[PDB]
């Protein structure tokens, strides 16, 4: 209606008289508040902008230094601290959390459909992100894919990255135990060349023309955990996810996590940035720090 | 103060700066030249230097001879003699 | 090349004596020009001769051999400028070009002497700005080893200096929700991560490097010329920020 | 204009009048007055804050009629551009967005938001699926069935 | 052990008996069940067929450009005749994403083995020297059937060991991320084997930034000889649009005459095309696949592009397609054009036969815009003979109507720009067969504003909070959620409004003054579960201590999110901020 509708707007623009537009039909006008008393006449300028940063970042006086400490307040054993924290986490927002969790369910078909084409999956946002994937994977993916492939359910392992002892050689050992790939000759391990990387480079070519199906899924939690965020492990997973037979569902929590990866890694690792925020307490994660 | 004089650009000084440093007139601030034994020479090639990684022209250097030494050493009849005293 | 030019010119007036004489005087010119450059070395002179001989031979002629001073005047250009390396300088994206521009500023400018020139908002609530640099500096920190900084500084300054995009129309709703200013997307993160492997942004040199840490300081490894070449090519101007202090 | 003027003064009934020219309720006017008398100490021009407050009250309470008639947007903006005697309006746009930034996190503002269900002009139950990453999100390029049912009558009588 | 205490451990999944359901595919019955499972099967099969069909050209083109670059590199790497015989051929891949593999021609009377070095295996000189020697020996030994140490003597002793001369090719994989003094030492060492008159070698730098960027980072001693004989290549996945245009045109042809694109989508893709030059086609194909996935997930009319299913044109589909606004425009235009109303009653829903007849009549159309783009590309390639030109840009200009203004950039087709100007006007039923990101999902799942979207929720916490009012009593927090904001939002607000440095005790009390006392105590009363908590709450300062509890756990959580760099070790009594909103 491009040519006519503009004429309609132009003609109808000049018609209505500004005076007689009654915004509300049945309103009673605002009177004068009686008392003057109730109207008692009791930091920086910018809060969220680079000028806000500038304003908040300036100099302060030393004698204006309130040298106060938490010992100027009760300090009691951590047992009841955790008790009350868990009480609040189990009784303060339980009903809304359950309802929003149920609302966040109908996207499982979308998740599975995307996984079908071989796209590695993302999960960022606020709150614990463990009580979502552990029930997503087991209760949706393996049975549905097992039935669609036509047999046994597709097996899976879990990778707790937040572990300060999370290494990669044991992970590759488990990969060898489960998938059972072929070993390497002596003419390719070039002068102490790392075994796992070359083995995976052989495996990707071995699977380059195998039936386009699924055989296993590996899950990760807190990908940016202390001993898991290291370049070796990250490179291993980034070269890993070219497999069609397997794909990864990933959880993330850090604000600057997105700078940890390289453009090549993103090209080979192909997350799809789904946002899922829940405002959860992460009680069980409060065990390492 | 006044056959003419020509100054040489940064590109021209680039080539000759290494000729200076390779003739044992300058050094690096926290330098250590030649390790005595095998283990030290081995660790030398394993761990690299800030001077190695930072660019050419901003690594801290050091001097061998001092102004007054050069002043009493050089032939004082040079046109640059008037410019050998701080 | 001798025989090449002797028949490219097609002049039947020559002899080995005169060939040797012309080569001898050309070498006399070479040494008289570049002795100050090197002095008493042979290897570099031979390399330079191999590089620049053909251009001189391409200019010699009958009149130039009869009177070699004009021949030297016609080939004086290589003597005056070696220029022995190799319009454009890059085939990169725009944010890669424009963000490296910011970093040079964020390590050669004082953190406090920038709020005067790097602000464009109109004040609303009460507050005073600073007086800037009351005292001129006489060292021109171009000559100095650069400083350290956190990345949020780069974010802020890049947001400030970013070219204009998100064209508006001043309509009833055009600018009501456009928010015409680049924000912290993912592409800048990725192209910045690329730069470290490009070794143009330098961090504290570390085996077992960790891009993610509260305590990491950052820096750059580029001279003034690297940054200058970008400015006029992209039609950006920052020389005025540095040309006034010293 | 009304914003270039510096260090102006105001009273209860002046801004009550300015808010009552729209016929808005009294609770909103009282809330604006409380905001003013609490945070009118570090000001430069109270016209900006009061104008922003009343405009963002109108947009939140009048979402229904604005939705059913996209003409209102221009009429309201013209009325509040003529009442403050200005021809330029980007300053009014700032007077809206800055107050939105400032007043973004107060519980009474929360109560107003849940009451009049604007949440940026779109419903909660739709925006959650709009932003969560689904394709079932109901972008209403199509039209509702009752619209067609009531439109049929217009051409039912086309013979005349 | 508890479940998640360990790391990299495994758990086996169990299975139910079976479901005997052919509906074991993600696609779902749209229209509140007014779809048919047979139609779902049709959509599934058609999507897979078309996806594989397009992937056929995906593989063809990815192999084609790879073969093109292999042929070019081999052409420019061999037969480059030197005359001094004391210099090696150096090649420069200006900006190549350095992970492709190159071939090696035999050229009998010469044995050839490639050399590849990575930063990991290049800490010092001798190590990578041994790598190269081991490679050369183990490659040239088995090919013809005693041991010699790994050194530069072996290469010059190759003749009197194997009988054949050798030519080497070197490929520094990641040229930029290696130690430059080690590189200089290595090159100086290798220039010491040009005194045997029986060997040739060649070096290739797979550069990523530029030549002038690093040619002065390394000492000019090495650079002098490197100016002798070089080669330069412009390297990228999107070279001259020679294949991006092909991908766009093949995608147009595979689904030609069924779908079109708006100006917004085309401009969005044009903008994101130049944000990463090295990888440009992979991402556009990725997001196009995502777009088709979403389209075939959400469009119930996917089954009406194959003519076979025209027989299943149902009444519900007729109803929903009748609501098309451009169809409404057509109806009203005809109403105004003709006072009599016989054809509209003949064709309109009042008799659905005419409606479906019209549906097929305007479905068989060609959507001439796509064909116009196709033969406009044909015109360009046949008369202007241009390959350095996007087709997506021309699509955008045609959609805008500025196609004449954009071809004016070239100005060689001016004598025919008028006839080639496709008057861009909307088509009927444009809303169900087209694609554009008015939904606001592509930027939400491909290029999100990460911390912007994070902080939006952190600050609002109503875009996700269930806004419910009736079921309060059953929930323990029924009387509390309505009146209290959650910890995180209030902490974020105070944290942002605070200054650069923030104390702990005064800041905690400032936060604490935003809490209710009797109401939170009532919330605690509601739960008789924790007797320890009952005894804790029986005292007044219990409110202060629970506020401290939540404060502590919340700030602990914030710490690992990157918001704070906990300052003043040995004191732990004040902090600093690093993350800003917006």
Curated annotation (Swiss-Prot), chain A:
Stretches with biased composition (Polar residues): 15-29
Positions of the UniProt region annotated as Disordered: 15-36
Domain of life: Eukaryota
Localization (cell): Nucleus
Disulfide bond annotation, renumbered to this chain: none
Known role: Component of the origin recognition complex (ORC) that binds origins of replication. It has a role in both chromosomal replication and mating type transcriptional silencing. Binds to the ARS consensus sequence (ACS) of origins of replication.
Family under the similarity heading: Belongs to the ORC2 family.
Known partners and oligomeric status: Component of the origin recognition complex (ORC) composed of at least ORC1, ORC2, ORC3, ORC4, ORC5 and ORC6. Interacts with MCM10 and TAH11.
Further details from the record: Present with 1700 molecules/cell in log phase SD medium.
Name of the molecule in the record: Origin recognition complex subunit 2
Curated annotation (Swiss-Prot), chain B:
Cellular localization per UniProt: Nucleus
Superkingdom as given in the UniProt entry: Eukaryota
Protein family per UniProt: Belongs to the ORC4 family.
Job of this protein: Component of the origin recognition complex (ORC) that binds origins of replication. It has a role in both chromosomal replication and mating type transcriptional silencing. Binds to the ARS consensus sequence (ACS) of origins of replication.
Note: Present with 2170 molecules/cell in log phase SD medium.
Subunit record text: Component of the origin recognition complex (ORC) composed of at least ORC1, ORC2, ORC3, ORC4, ORC5 and ORC6.
Protein's recorded name: Origin recognition complex subunit 4
Curated annotation (Swiss-Prot), chain C:
Record keywords: ATP-binding, DNA replication, Nucleotide-binding, Nucleus
Superkingdom of source: Eukaryota
GO molecular function, one term: ATP binding
GO biological process: DNA replication initiation; pre-replicative complex assembly involved in nuclear cell cycle DNA replication; regulation of DNA replication; silent mating-type cassette heterochromatin formation
Any single Gene Ontology cellular-component annotation: nucleus
Subcellular location per the Swiss-Prot or TrEMBL entry: Nucleus
Metal-binding found in the keyword field: no
Note: Present with 768 molecules/cell in log phase SD medium.
Family: Belongs to the ORC5 family.
Subunit structure: Component of the origin recognition complex (ORC) composed of at least ORC1, ORC2, ORC3, ORC4, ORC5 and ORC6. Interacts with ORC6. Component of a cullin-RING ligase (CRL)-like complex composed of at least the cullin RTT101, a linker protein MMS1, and the potential substrate receptor ORC5. Interacts with RTT101 and MMS1.
Function: Component of the origin recognition complex (ORC) that binds origins of replication. It has a role in both chromosomal replication and mating type transcriptional silencing. Binds to the ARS consensus sequence (ACS) of origins of replication. This subunit is a candidate for the mediation of ATP-dependent binding of ORC to origins. May also be a substrate targeting component of a cullin-RING-based E3 ubiquitin-protein ligase complex RTT101(MMS1-ORC5).
Protein name: Origin recognition complex subunit 5
Record organism: Saccharomyces cerevisiae (strain ATCC 204508 / S288c)
Encoding gene, per UniProt annotation: ORC5
From Swiss-Prot, chain D:
Subcellular location, record wording: Nucleus
Cystine pairings recorded for this chain: none
Domain of life: Eukaryota
Function summary: Component of the origin recognition complex (ORC) that binds origins of replication. It has a role in both chromosomal replication and mating type transcriptional silencing. Binds to the ARS consensus sequence (ACS) of origins of replication.
The family this protein is said to belong to: Belongs to the ORC6 family.
More info: Present with 2970 molecules/cell in log phase SD medium.
Subunit structure comment from the entry: Component of the origin recognition complex (ORC) composed of at least ORC1, ORC2, ORC3, ORC4, ORC5 and ORC6. Interacts with ORC3, ORC5 and TAH11.
Protein name in the entry: Origin recognition complex subunit 6
Organism, as annotated: Saccharomyces cerevisiae (strain ATCC 204508 / S288c)
Portion of the full sequence shown: 271 to 430 of 435
């Amino acid at each position: 209606l491009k040519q006519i509708i503009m004429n309609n707007l132009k003609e109808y623009k000049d018609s209505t008289s500004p005076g007689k537009l009654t915004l509300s039909r049945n309103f009673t006008p605002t009177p004068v508040p009686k008392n003057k008393k109730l109207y008692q006449t009791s930091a920086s300028s910018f809060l969220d902008t680079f000028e806000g940063y500038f304003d908040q970042r300036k100099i302060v006086r030393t004698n204006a230094k309130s040298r106060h400490t938490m010992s100027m307040a009760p300090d009691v054993t951590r047992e009841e601290f955790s008790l009350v924290s868990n009480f609040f986490n189990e009784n303060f927002q339980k009903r809304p959390r359950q309802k929003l969790f149920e609302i966040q369910k109908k996207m499982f078909p979308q998740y599975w459909f995307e996984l079908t084409q071989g796209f590695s999956l993302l999960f960022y946002g606020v709150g614990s992100k463990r009580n979502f994937l552990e029930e997503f994977a087991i209760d949706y993916l393996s049975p549905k894919i097992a039935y669609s492939q036509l047999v046994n359910s597709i097996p899976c392992l879990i990778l707790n990255g937040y572990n300060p002892s999370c290494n990669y050689r044991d992970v590759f050992k488990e990969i060898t135990d489960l998938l059972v790939p072929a070993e390497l000759t002596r003419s390719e391990t070039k002068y102490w060349g790392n075994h796992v990387i070359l083995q995976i480079q052989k495996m990707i070519d071995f699977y380059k023309n195998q039936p386009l199906d699924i055989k296993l899924i590996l899950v990760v939690h807190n990908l940016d955990g202390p001993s898991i965020r290291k370049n070796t492990f990250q490179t291993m997973l980034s070269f890993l996810s070219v497999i069609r037979q397997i794909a990864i569902v990933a959880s993330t929590d850090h604000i600057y996590a997105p700078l940890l990866w390289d453009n090549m890694k993103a090209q080979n690792y192909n997350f799809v940035f789904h946002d899922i925020s829940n405002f959860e307490p992460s009680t069980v994660e409060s065990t390492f720090q | 103060r006044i056959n003419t004089i020509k100054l040489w650009l940064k590109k021209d000084v680039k080539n000759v700066w290494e000729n200076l440093v390779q003739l044992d007139f300058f050094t690096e601030k926290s330098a250590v030249g030649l390790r005595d034994n095998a283990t030290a020479a081995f660790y030398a090639s394993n761990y690299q230097f800030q001077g190695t990684m930072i660019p050419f022209d901003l690594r801290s250097y050091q001097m061998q001879i001092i102004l007054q030494e050069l002043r009493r050493i050089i032939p004082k009849s040079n046109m640059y003699y008037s410019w050998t005293q701080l | 090349c001798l025989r090449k030019r002797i028949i490219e010119e097609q002049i039947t007036d020559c002899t080995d004596d005169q060939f040797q004489n012309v080569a001898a005087n050309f070498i006399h010119l070479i040494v008289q020009a570049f002795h100050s450059y090197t002095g008493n070395d042979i290897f570099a002179l031979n390399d330079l001769i191999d590089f620049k001989w053909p251009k001189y031979v391409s200019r010699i002629t009958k009149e130039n051999i009869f009177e070699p001073l004009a021949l030297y005047k016609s080939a004086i250009k290589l003597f005056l400028s070696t220029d022995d390396n190799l319009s454009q300088t890059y085939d990169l994206s725009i944010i890669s070009k424009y963000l490296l521009i910011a970093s040079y500023i964020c390590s050669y400018l004082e953190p406090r002497y920038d709020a005067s020139i790097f602000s464009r908002k109109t004040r609303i609530i009460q507050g005073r700005a600073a007086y800037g640099r009351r005292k001129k500096k006489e060292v021109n920190p171009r000559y100095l080893q650069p400083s350290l900084f956190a990345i949020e500084r780069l974010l802020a300054i890049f947001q400030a200096i970013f070219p204009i995009q998100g064209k508006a129309e001043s309509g009833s709703l055009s600018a009501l929700r456009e928010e015409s200013l680049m924000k912290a997307n993912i592409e800048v993160f990725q192209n910045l991560s690329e730069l470290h492997t490009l070794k143009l942004i330098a961090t504290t040199m570390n085996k077992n490097i960790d891009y993610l840490s509260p305590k990491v300081r950052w820096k750059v490894n580029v001279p003034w010329e690297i940054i200058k070449e970008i400015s006029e090519s992209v039609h950006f101007n920052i020389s005025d920020y540095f040309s006034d202090i010293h | 204009s009304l914003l270039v003027k510096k260090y102006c003064k105001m009273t209860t009934e002046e801004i009550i009048r300015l808010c009552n020219d729209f016929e808005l309720p009294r609770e909103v006017a009282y809330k604006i007055v409380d905001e003013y008398n609490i945070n009118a100490s570090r000001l430069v021009c109270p016209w900006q804050l009061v104008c922003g407050l009343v405009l963002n009250c109108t947009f939140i309470v009048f979402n229904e009629r604005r939705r059913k008639d996209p003409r209102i947007d221009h009429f309201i903006v013209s009325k509040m551009c003529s009442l403050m005697l200005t021809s330029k309006v980007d300053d009014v746009i700032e007077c809206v967005k800055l107050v939105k930034e400032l007043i973004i996190g107060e519980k009474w503002f929360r109560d107003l938001q849940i009451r009049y269900d604007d949440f940026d002009g779109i419903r909660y139950d739709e925006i959650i699926f709009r932003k969560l990453g689904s394709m079932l999100q109901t972008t209403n390029i199509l039209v509702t069935d009752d619209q067609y049912n009531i439109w049929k009558k217009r051409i039912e009588m086309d013979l005349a | 052990f508890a479940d998640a205490q360990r790391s990299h451990y495994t758990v086996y999944p169990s299975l139910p008996q079976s479901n005997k359901n052919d509906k074991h595919i993600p696609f779902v019955k749209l229209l509140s069940g007014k779809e048919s499972e047979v139609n779902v099967e049709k959509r599934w099969e058609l999507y897979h067929q078309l996806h594989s069909h397009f992937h056929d050209q995906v593989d063809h083109i990815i192999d084609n450009i790879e073969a093109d670059l292999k042929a070019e590199i081999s052409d420019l790497l061999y037969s480059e005749t030197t005359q001094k015989r004391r210099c090696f051929n150096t090649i420069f891949l200006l900006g190549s994403d350095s992970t492709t593999k190159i071939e090696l021609k035999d050229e009998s009377s010469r044995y050839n083995v490639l050399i590849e070095l990575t930063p990991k295996e290049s800490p010092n000189v001798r190590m990578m020297l041994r790598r190269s020697m081991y490679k050369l020996y183990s490659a040239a030994d088995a090919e013809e059937h005693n041991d010699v140490s790994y050194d530069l003597s072996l290469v010059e002793n190759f003749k009197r060991l194997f009988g054949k001369d050798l030519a080497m090719v070197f490929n520094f994989k990641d040229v930029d991320s290696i130690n430059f003094n080690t590189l200089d030492n290595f090159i100086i060492l290798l220039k010491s084997a040009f005194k045997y008159d029986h060997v040739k070698i060649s070096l290739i730098f797979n550069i990523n930034t530029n030549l002038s960027n690093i040619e002065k980072n390394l000492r000019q001693s090495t650079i002098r000889l490197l100016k002798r004989n070089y080669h330069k290549l412009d390297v990228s996945s999107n070279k001259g649009f020679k294949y991006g245009n092909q991908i766009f045109q093949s995608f147009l042809d595979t689904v030609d005459g069924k779908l079109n694109l708006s100006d917004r989508f085309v401009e969005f893709i044009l903008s994101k095309m130049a944000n990463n030059t090295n990888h440009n086609l992979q991402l556009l194909t990725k997001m196009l696949d995502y777009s088709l996935m979403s389209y075939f997930f959400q469009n119930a009319f996917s089954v009406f592009i194959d003519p076979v299913n025209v027989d299943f044109l149902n009444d519900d589909y007729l109803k929903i397609l009748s609501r098309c606004p451009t169809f409404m425009f057509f109806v009203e235009g005809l109403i105004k054009q003709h006072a009599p109303a016989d054809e509209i009653l003949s064709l309109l829903t009042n008799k659905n036969r005419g409606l479906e007849e019209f549906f097929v009549e305007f479905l068989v159309r060609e959507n001439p815009i796509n064909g116009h783009a196709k033969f406009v590309a044909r015109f360009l390639e046949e008369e202007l003979n241009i390959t350095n030109f996007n087709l997506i840009e021309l699509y955008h200009n045609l959609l805008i109507g500025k196609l004449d203004s954009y071809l004016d950039r070239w100005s060689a087709c001016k004598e025919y720009k008028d006839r080639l100007h496709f008057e861009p006007i909307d088509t009927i039923f444009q809303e169900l067969f087209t694609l554009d990101n008015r939904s606001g999902l592509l930027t939400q799942s491909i290029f999100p504003s990460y911390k912007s979207n994070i902080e939006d929720n952190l600050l609002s916490w109503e875009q996700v909070l269930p806004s419910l009012d009736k079921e309060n009593y059953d929930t323990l927090s029924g009387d509390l959620d309505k009146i209290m904001a959650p910890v995180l939002g209030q902490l974020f607000k105070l944290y942002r409004e605070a200054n650069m440095t923030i104390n702990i005790y005064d800041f905690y009390i400032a936060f604490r003054e935003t809490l209710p006392k009797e109401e939170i105590l009532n919330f605690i009363r509601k739960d008789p579960s924790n007797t320890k908590l009952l005894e804790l709450a029986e005292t007044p300062d219990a409110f202060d201590k629970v506020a401290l509890i939540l404060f502590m756990q919340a700030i602990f959580a914030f710490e690992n999110m990157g918001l704070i760099k906990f300052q003043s070790t040995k004191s732990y009594d004040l902090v600093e901020k690093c993350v800003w909103r917006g």
